[PDB]
Amino acid sequence: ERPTFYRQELKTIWEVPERYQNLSPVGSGAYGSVCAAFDTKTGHRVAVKKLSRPFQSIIHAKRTYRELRLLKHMKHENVIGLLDVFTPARSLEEFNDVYLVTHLMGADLNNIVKCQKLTDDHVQFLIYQILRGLKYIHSADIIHRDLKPSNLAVNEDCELKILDFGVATRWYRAPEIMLNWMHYNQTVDIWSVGCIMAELLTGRTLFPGTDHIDQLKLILRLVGTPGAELLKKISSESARNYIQSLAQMPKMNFANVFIGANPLAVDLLEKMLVLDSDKRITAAQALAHAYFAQYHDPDDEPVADPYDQSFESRDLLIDEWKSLTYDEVISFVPPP
Template identity: 30%
Template sequence: MNNTNSSVKDNNINENKKKKYDTNKNVKEKNEKIDIKKALIKNVKVPDNYEIKHLIGKGSYGFVYLAYDHNAKKSVAIKKINRMFEDLVDCKRILREITILNRLKSPYIIGLHDLIIPEDLLTFDEIYIVLEIADSDLKKLFRTPIFLSEAHVKTILYNLLLGEKFIHESGIIHRDLKPANCLLNQDCSVKICDFGLARTINTDKDTHIVNDLEEKEENEKPGPHNKNLCKQLTSHVVTRWYRAPELILLQENYTHAIDIWSTGCIFAELLNMIENHQNDATERFPLFPGSSCFPLSPDRNSKKVHEKSNRDQLNIIFNVMGTPTEEDLQSIDKEEVIKYIKLFPPRKGISLKDKYHCISDDGIDLLESMLKFNAKKRITIDEALEHKYLYDIRKKDLENFDTKKIILPFDDWMTLTETQLRYIFLKEIQSFHSDLIIPSEFLIHENNFYNNS
């Protein structure tokens, strides 16, 4: 009896010790997280007029902070890019985004507010980009349990199209339109962001986008400058679910139409936000949620790729939209690609009208027009803005932009050295801080690569 009581007592003591240990462990972990957040904020080196509030995002590039600019009397987002010269491919993408945003001024594009002067102009390895801030983005919206009215959907879509029109008229293809890159405010205004993969199409070379060579992303080893990079048509343009067929198939001379396809995919997700289309918010999915892109891999002729049940991106598109017609196949410039597509079992696809039954035939027509396999048949930005579905919310006066073709200060097809990249970064920073004097070490190289126009 005494042994039993002693055993129970010991068990209670051990259980209490375990609870106390678990509690202390949880408190310790919580405190560690708080300490890390404090350290991340403390490590931000910006001028005194910027008051860092808290961390709002992080990624492979670095961190994003909410801050208050006491000079401008408004909240801003500050993106801190770390170790920016470790990989010159990624570094050039950062530079491309900065140079494009510094030249694109529109209510429909995220505003570049400031570039912070680095502490050491010769050896800096991080940069602080100060950006306009928005309430949310479409990716976050799609994950919420709220529902939208059709008027909301139309307004958001229309504002997104206005932003695209401005971008395209400025001579730019965004190439990475997806919900996360469409910032959203409570008034349904949209601001397009993230131009790291964008391209200008203003020169003779630009019109032949077969020359759109980007350093290969897959199978790269991290390390200084990635010198052994293999060049090919970009394989990582646009998140897979929003990628146009011509990008999946590595077609040459693709156009603004790739952005239209991405917009159609986003439009479909907006329609999922209407309660009568999907009353369970947890069941909302992208229209083409593929899990791979086999045409970009060595397995391109594997039989498994062409089975209807396969989750390959192109297969998912064909399941929804149907396989392309013979006429559509003739728009493809590579015979091997045509042969590859013909290996897919023919199918008609689904009825988008049945899927999105609460919107008018005009709405379905607009959606289908954006998702044409044949890019030449895909609706244009102007045609989309003029479409009957948007008649009741259209404001023609908003569609007249005074745009200028964007010319980047560097050749986007040129491989830039670290020294050249540093110089262009400093030139962009100088556009915000005219008193900045660029070290003479950089100036001797200027005429070899820098475009002052």
Template identity: 55%
Template sequence: MAIAARSRTGFYRQEVNRTVWEVPERYRDLKQVGTGAYGTVCSAWDRRSGTQVAIKKLHRPFQSKLFAKRAYRELRLLKHMKHENVIGLLDVFTAEILLDQLRDFYLVMPFMGTDLGKLMKMERLSEDRVQFLVYQMLKGLKYIHSAGIIHRDLKPGNLAINPDCELKVKHFETKIYGLDFFFSNWPNFYITSLLQILDFGLARQAVSEMTGYVVTRWYRAPEVILNWMHYTQTVDIWSAGCIMAEMLLGKPLFKGNDHLDQLREIMKITGTPTPDFVVKLQSQDARNYIRSLSKVPKKDLHFVFSKASSNAVCVLEKMLLLDPECRVSASEALELPFFSEFRDVEEETEALPYDQTLDNADLPLDQWKRHTFTEILTFRPPRDSRETSL
């Protein structure tokens, strides 16, 4: 191992909240905007593109095999996704020039000012705006799902809105603090909006086994709450339905205090499961528990959402189904009449195949580090910055 690390030419050091950041000269005016369990995010001015960006520094990505695998997977997925409704990677860098000196690396993404959760606290959204925003979310989900990826943590805080009134889905494992947001003269004033989905640290391939505790409870699909069955992309459709419902109601639809309370809140709307659904459950304990519950009839969503249009309620009826096999897919949802005003089929593209071979491998720490270093060195910026940047 080398005794001391040499910084690359063209990099400089800056202390941000008692942490040293070592970044290329092109990125200036670093300011911390959020921090979480897995990383810290700073806003910065990119002198080359003339735009504000977000730079994420992962917390000790090579401290263990688990952290190294997570960091590798997040980097690979960010590199792979290229769609206007999925957050893109603008740059990735490390100040280290040798593999054995690699300790940190940084991810550069578009900067977002606020998120949907904060917006909903400030004001009630009109149905026109709900149409517009949910359409963006579904386009992003269609793209991600086509690559075999499940997001697993969709929630209002992961629907980020940039200062130019564009909506994006993100997750920096942080809370982003930023600019106020407003719509002017809606719907007479057209606003270009991008919904970009991130949180590839938690995302998994559909074929992988997953545990449910990481997902925010209020937006969690019922099959995830009790680990009833093998998950599919429709867990994200349930979350999308919960988000849409909250946008229409002005408050969360299912606000459980714990796992079982969350399930009870869900069944007040969906009704208790049918025998056909119960027999699909993998766990005998889950089957016994469901059979022990008092029978509750399904509620009419037109009554629950009495102020919403029938087209809006139709979307929710197809998303918020207890049986995941019966839920609409993102692609199918986009075809519903509720979205016809904004629909552009040419923008509803699918992803190139994603090679998940290494993502499911069990490798020693030094090999994860080597693979990550290779991914950093082989990164090429997007040719058309409009794919990923603001």
């Protein structure tokens, strides 16, 4: 039974089920067209995102479908999930707007740290949750690709979720992406986690580059010029020359960069900030690292159901993407 909707303005107009009350814009553009609301069904505050021009073009329609598919798939404590999705339309013919309802978080990870060191216990808890969510995301063959403190949100009980509010900042970007090395694996996200973890411990950005070149120079000063093993995997002579032109010395010992830090934290940072992404620790491996002994539970670090992203390879018409999106709205099943 279709609930009754009500309209509102909010310089953006919102038609939502009566279920959602007390709507108010939040983030003022940083979050998009997002309002906080009171979910009368559960008595919890929620976030309502209205999609912008979802079916204006093939690209818009496919992006709308993609985001709905991703959100419908993510069912994990440390990843943003879909509480509801709705449209005022009563038919595919009238279908032109999509609203996504998620949990409302309280702050991102810039708001928690505020340029001050966190305790080592608190860093364990925060990074453990990030890695727990990444193990889940990566098990579905999904790569975040833009992990950074602003895409990590917490509530008052310090419970953390991974989202994507999106390039804005390069401070957390893996060197292989910056170098256009083309073959990326999931540990580009592990690089970002390493940068975040270092920042939580020290209160300082690990690699605060002024521009693209400076960012790579700062990275390579810490992690060193490519070793012989990594150089063997670089096809292009110009590519080999270019990376060496930005570097010089071997890597530094992280034990003499993170003075006063838990030696287990330093060991983990070493394994996350490896230049060769083939040698970089995975999320599942990192969760078993002794640094997380007080939080690690091998039986509550779940993986995702298989995620069918064969649609990514397809060239469909605008009405086909729209119909596929409409079918995914209809088939949605709320959580418990």
